[PDB]
Amino acid sequence: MPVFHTRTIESILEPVAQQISHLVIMHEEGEVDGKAIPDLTAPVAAVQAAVSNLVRVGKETVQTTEDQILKRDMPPAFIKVENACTKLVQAAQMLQSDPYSVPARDYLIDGSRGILSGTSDLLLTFDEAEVRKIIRVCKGILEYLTVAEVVETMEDLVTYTKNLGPGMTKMAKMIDERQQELTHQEHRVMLVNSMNTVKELLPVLISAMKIFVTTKNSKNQGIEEALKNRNFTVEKMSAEINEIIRVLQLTSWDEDAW
């Protein structure tokens, strides 16, 4: 079998791997031969009909995508399955010709088992490019967390906030979906806890900036205490987002690219 990385990859392939698992291991107990050649004229039609969709949408997803590791990885996988829609529609001519073929009804126990892997591989490719888009977003927030350091003005503050808040919303949104997709409880807890700690320091960051941006309008003011505070918050929020970023990297790390 293989390694199902998400709950949705598992959900799709799992059954048809639990299928070929029993539909394999039970064949020592004596399961006798039989067949249904006509109902194989169709199943291989839509099995070559959807192996035609995955390929199709897999072509818009290969051309419309800017990811480079995507193109250097996905189109190839169009091949893995291509032979599965071939060594099975082939098993079609080994269970039609000789309806007692011990090799034939075993070329479906491999052809299809190869139809999967082309799909298990197709999905990891795509899911891994998703994780890249998430990491890029978090790197975006890390950098913008940095300009907070250069906000001296009330309308600097208003611009900063106007811009930041929507990156936070985009990051939490993605960190939320992605976690709601992970199979290990420990990675999930990490993503969620860190994302929660950064949502909680956000308002604390902006607060201290406002006391900086306005206590800088009442001479003889306790300014430095506001900067110092500002800085700690960014140091904490940055540690956090880097924690997140790393756990995503650990989970989705490249094989045919660096």
């Binding site: 048809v16 299928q19 399961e31 194989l40 839509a46 099995v47 997803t61 999967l116 799909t119």
Partner: peptide, 26 residues
Amino acid sequence: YTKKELIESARKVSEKVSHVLAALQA
């Protein structure tokens, strides 16, 4: 709708390939 498109177009492939491994419980 589009980001799934690949998932749903490949959940199909898996199920029609499940109907095929069907006939082997004879």
